[PDB]
Design a protein around this ligand. Structure first.
Ligand SMILES: Cn1ccc2c(ccn2CC(=O)Nc2ccncc2Cl)c1=O
Ligand SMILES: Cn1ccc2c(ccn2CC(=O)Nc2ccncc2Cl)c1=O
Lengths: 128, 128
C-alpha cells in the first residue's frame, strides 16, 4: 500500500521555508554540531546542511572515521571571505558574486566540491 | 561592506536539492539525533528538520531543558500512519492526502502545530 511522491500534493514553498528556518537555527547556534576553522576565523554550522551542499563535507562526514568531528580546519590557503559567502549560499540559495570576490569564491567552491556554483562562477567570468 | 540577499544570484533548485539530500541522510540514518516513538512504531529524524517544519517540535527542542532529548514519546492517541505521512512531507514537500487517511493526517498536523498543512487538509475536505 503506497502513494508515490509524484501523485502527492506539492507544497511549492516548503523546501525554501525549511532552509530559511535552518538558517534561523544557525543564527541562534541551535543544534550546530561543527566549527569550521578558516585561518583566523571560525564558522559554526549543521553537518547535515554542509553534507547536503558540498562534496568535500559530504565525503568527510559520511566516513564513520570523521562523522563525529566537532572541529574541521580548512586548508590554510582558503579565503575566509570566500568560505563565508559560500556558507551563506548553502543556507539561503543566494550567492553573492562580485568582481571583487569572484576568484576567491570560485577557488573556494572548487575546494568545497560545489560543481554547480563553480559552473556559475565560470558564467560570471564569461559575463565580465 | 555588504551584499543584501535580495541583490544576490538566486539558485531556484538549491532549497529543494538540500531537502532531498537531508531525506537521503535520514534514509541512511546519518546524523539523525532523535527517535520519535508513536505507539508501537519508531521513526528516526534530524531535530533541525523537525523544528523547521513543526510548532510542536520547535517548542520542545528550542527549550534548553529538552534540547538534548534523544527520544520523544508522542501522545498515545496519535495515529502512526498520520505521523509517518507528515514526517515524509517534512522531508519531501509532498503530502499524501487520501479519503482513507485525511482525518488521521489532519488530527496529527493539529497536534504537530503544522498550520499550513491543517489548512490544506480543510481544503481537501471542502473538495470531497
Ligand atoms: C560534485 N559534488 C558533490 C557533492 C555535492 C555537490 C553539491 C552538493 N553535494 C552534496 C551531496 O550531494 N550530498 C549528498 C549526496 C547523497 N546523499 C546525501 C547527501 Cl547529503 C557537488 O557538486
Ligand atoms: C503554527 N506553526 C508554528 C511553527 C511552525 C509551523 C510550521 C513550521 N514551524 C516551525 C518553525 O517555524 N520553526 C522555526 C521558527 C523560527 N526559527 C527557527 C525555526 Cl526552526 C507552524 O505552522
Amino acid at each position: 500500500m503506497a502513494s508515490p511522491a509524484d501523485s502527492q500534493i506539492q507544497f511549492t514553498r516548503h523546501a525554501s521555508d525549511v532552509l530559511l528556518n535552518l538558517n534561523r537555527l544557525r543564527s541562534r547556534d541551535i543544534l550546530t554540531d561543527v566549527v569550521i576553522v578558516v585561518s583566523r576565523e571560525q564558522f559554526r554550522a549543521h553537518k547535515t546542511v554542509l553534507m547536503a551542499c558540498s562534496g568535500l563535507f559530504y565525503s568527510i562526514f559520511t566516513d564513520q572515521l570523521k562523522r563525529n568531528l566537532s572541529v574541521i580546519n580548512l586548508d590554510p590557503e582558503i579565503n575566509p571571505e570566500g568560505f563565508n559567502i559560500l556558507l551563506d549560499f548553502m543556507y539561503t540559495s543566494r550567492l553573492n558574486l562580485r568582481e571583487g570576490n569572484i576568484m576567491a569564491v570560485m577557488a573556494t567552491a572548487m575546494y568545497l566540491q560545489m560543481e554547480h556554483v563553480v559552473d556559475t562562477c565560470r558564467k560570471f567570468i564569461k559575463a565580465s
